Amino acid sequence: AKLQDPIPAKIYDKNGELVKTLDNGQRHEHVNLKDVPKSMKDAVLATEDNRFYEHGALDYKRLFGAIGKGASTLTQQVVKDAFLSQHKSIGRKAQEAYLSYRLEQEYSKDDIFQVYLNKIYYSDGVTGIKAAAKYYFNKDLKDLNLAEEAYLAGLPQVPNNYNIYDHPKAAEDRKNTVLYLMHYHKRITDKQWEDAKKIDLKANLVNRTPEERQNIDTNQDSEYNSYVNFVKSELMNNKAFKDENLGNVLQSGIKIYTNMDKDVQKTLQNDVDNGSFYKNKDQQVGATILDSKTGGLVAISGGRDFKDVVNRNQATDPHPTGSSLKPFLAYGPAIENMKWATNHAIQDESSYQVDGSTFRNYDTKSHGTVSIYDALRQSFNIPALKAWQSVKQNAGNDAPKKFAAKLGLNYEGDIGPSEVLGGSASEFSPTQLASAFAAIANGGTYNNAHSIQKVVTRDGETIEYDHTSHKAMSDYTAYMLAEMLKGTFKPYGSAYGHGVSGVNMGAKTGTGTYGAETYSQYNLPDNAAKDVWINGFTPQYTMSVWMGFSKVKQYGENSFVGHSQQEYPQFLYENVMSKISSRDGEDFKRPSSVSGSIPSINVSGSQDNNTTNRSTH
Numbered sequence: 001a002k003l004q005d006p007i008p009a010k011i012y013d014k015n016g017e018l019v020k021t022l023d024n025g026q027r028h029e030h031v032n033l034k035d036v037p038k039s040m041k042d043a044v045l046a047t048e049d050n051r052f053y054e055h056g057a058l059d060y061k062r063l064f065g066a067i068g069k070g071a072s073t074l075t076q077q078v079v080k081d082a083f084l085s086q087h088k089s090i091g092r093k094a095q096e097a098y099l100s101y102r103l104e105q106e107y108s109k110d111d112i113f114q115v116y117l118n119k120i121y122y123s124d125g126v127t128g129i130k131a132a133a134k135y136y137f138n139k140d141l142k143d144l145n146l147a148e149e150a151y152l153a154g155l156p157q158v159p160n161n162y163n164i165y166d167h168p169k170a171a172e173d174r175k176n177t178v179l180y181l182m183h184y185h186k187r188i189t190d191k192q193w194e195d196a197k198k199i200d201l202k203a204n205l206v207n208r209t210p211e212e213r214q215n216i217d218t219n220q221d222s223e224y225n226s227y228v229n230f231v232k233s234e235l236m237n238n239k240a241f242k243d244e245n246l247g248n249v250l251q252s253g254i255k256i257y258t259n260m261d262k263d264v265q266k267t268l269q270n271d272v273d274n275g276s277f278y279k280n281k282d283q284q285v286g287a288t289i290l291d292s293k294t295g296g297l298v299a300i301s302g303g304r305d306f307k308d309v310v311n312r313n314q315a316t317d318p319h320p321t322g323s324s325l326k327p328f329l330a331y332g333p334a335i336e337n338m339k340w341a342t343n344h345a346i347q348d349e350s351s352y353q354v355d356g357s358t359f360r361n362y363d364t365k366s367h368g369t370v371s372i373y374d375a376l377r378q379s380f381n382i383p384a385l386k387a388w389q390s391v392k393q394n395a396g397n398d399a400p401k402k403f404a405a406k407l408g409l410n411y412e413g414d415i416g417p418s419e420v421l422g423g424s425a426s427e428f429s430p431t432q433l434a435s436a437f438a439a440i441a442n443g444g445t446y447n448n449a450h451s452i453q454k455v456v457t458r459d460g461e462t463i464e465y466d467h468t469s470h471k472a473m474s475d476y477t478a479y480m481l482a483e484m485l486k487g488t489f490k491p492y493g494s495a496y497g498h499g500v501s502g503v504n505m506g507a508k509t510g511t512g513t514y515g516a517e518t519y520s521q522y523n524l525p526d527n528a529a530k531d532v533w534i535n536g537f538t539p540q541y542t543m544s545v546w547m548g549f550s551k552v553k554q555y556g557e558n559s560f561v562g563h564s565q566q567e568y569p570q571f572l573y574e575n576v577m578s579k580i581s582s583r584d585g586e587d588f589k590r591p592s593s594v595s596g597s598i599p600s601i602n603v604s605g606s607q608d609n610n611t612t613n614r615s616t617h
Contacts, residue, residue: 031118036117079100151175259291374616434543447467483588536577
């Protein structure tokens with residue numbers, strides 16, 4: 001009982017402008033009957049079943065003469081195309097004949113004519129009349145002449161034999177007989193028939209070559225591929241669906257409106273695709289941008305040349321986070337729970353003892369007393385651990401967990417030192433972190449990255465989606481971390497040289513390393529990294545880029561060896577943020593509850609004794 005022509009999903013960007021239409025580039029466009037011009041409808045009827053609206057299930061008068069040796073009717077012609085085998089010999093015709101009478105009692109003449117004008121074949125993969133017209137002539141039905149209509153009307157009899165590109169002589173003669181039938185059946189006057197037949201069919205024929213016409217191009221506007229695969233995910237996580245089958249809803253005529261912004265999105269996949277900041281074809285990217293204020297998803301890249309069912313979405317897959325999470329497990333909680341200044345002096349060390357484990361910095365050598373501001377923007381390991389041990393001691397054994405749980409960063413088991421530093425269960429997607437950071441960007445208010453504004457269904461219902469929003473940290477903590485992390489772009493900062501000019505931004509970079517075992521096993525040099533991140537944010541936008549490799553090779557081929565290779569994600573970040581940020585000047589909103597100025601901010605009303613005026617180098 002499925003005559004329905006599938007009608008594919010349309011996506012719109014933030015402007016409500018149509019952006020991608022999930023039709024797999026197919027040469028098919030659904031057309032309602034009323035939107036088909038009378039002239040067109042005629043040319044078909046005249047050519048195939050002139051007496052269609054009287055009728056019923058074959059004229060009988062056309063089976064009076066046909067047995068006399070045939071021919072058939074829209075209704076039944078359609079029934080055949082509700083797949084009745086490829087064997088015929090009065091067998092197909094037997095079921096065809098009954099199904100016709102049944103279908104006529106369930107569906108109106110118009111609904112049958114419509115399914116006709118949508119399903120039938122026109123050669124070179126073209127199904128349906130609306131497609132035929134844009135294909136051969138690049139014309140909408142409304143403005144096309146009788147020659148064109150005649151031909152198109154004629155084509156579905158023996159499409160391949162009548163396809164103009166291949167058999168123009170044959171096409172001409174078939175268009176000619178269609179015109180004759182339209183005349184013979186009084187669908188057009190003597191004047192316009194004699195004025196129609198003297199028209200060049202090649203009139204506005206779009207010129208082409210063979211390999212373009214067997215190029216069913218199923219990867220168009222391929223920039224949207226990833227923003228699309230995110231829509232697909234979020235579509236189904238909502239009451240009104242889920243009970244349902246994705247594969248179906250995407251062909252049930254729905255209309256998705258997103259927070260995508262086209263230009264951010266093009267820019268982003270263009271830069272992922274055209275980057276030179278890749279060691280080898282095995283290097284991967286997952287980047288996500290989103291609106292700091294709302295958590296709405298502006299653009300997104302699952303990887304270089306990302307296709308949808310085929311490729312993994314690196315922007316929505318979990319990756320080991322490296323030093324990315326120190327603002328959430330160490331220094332942020334401290335500000336919220338014991339109201340540290342940005343100067344809280346911590347002692348760096350040679351190594352440190354946390355449980356039966358020995359931990360050291362990246363460079364190895366110690367730096368003595370340092371400010372948390374420096375410790376964060378240069379990403380020292382010990383001060384982080386120390387700070388987390390302080391928090392845990394003077395605020396709660398599970399106090400870190402609850403700061404991180406409020407920003408979407410959930411841990412199944414215990415949060416040990418490994419995971420303070422990006423190890424083990426500290427794995428999260430760039431999308432996950434982008435949210436985490438926009439909280440710092442936007443006064444401390446977390447927003448599970450959302451992508452769908454609403455969807456409008458063909459049957460007339462329209463569902464507004466929502467996203468799990470909730471205040472995650474007090475304003476001062478969000479502000480200080482924000483101003484603190486602008487220091488990442490300053491001299492000595494872990495991302496220096498990649499700041500943008502008129503724009504106020506902060507970032508925490510990331511550098512995940514391998515297991516102790518792995519270094520020897522694959523002869524990886526000491527300074528090789530498995531995962532690199534930059535997580536940056538302005539008051540407008542929050543971007544989180546991850547890069548990493550499919551699989552580890554010998555001597556670092558598929559690692560990031562040195563600053564020059566560990567730096568790659570910053571190139572992608574600066575290139576995009578640079579293009580897409582405005583230089584209006586908006587900064588991070590400052591509360592009354594903070595006091596002082598970088599590097600010395602402290603919680604107003606609760607000052608800290610342990611500050612230092614001690615610089616970097």
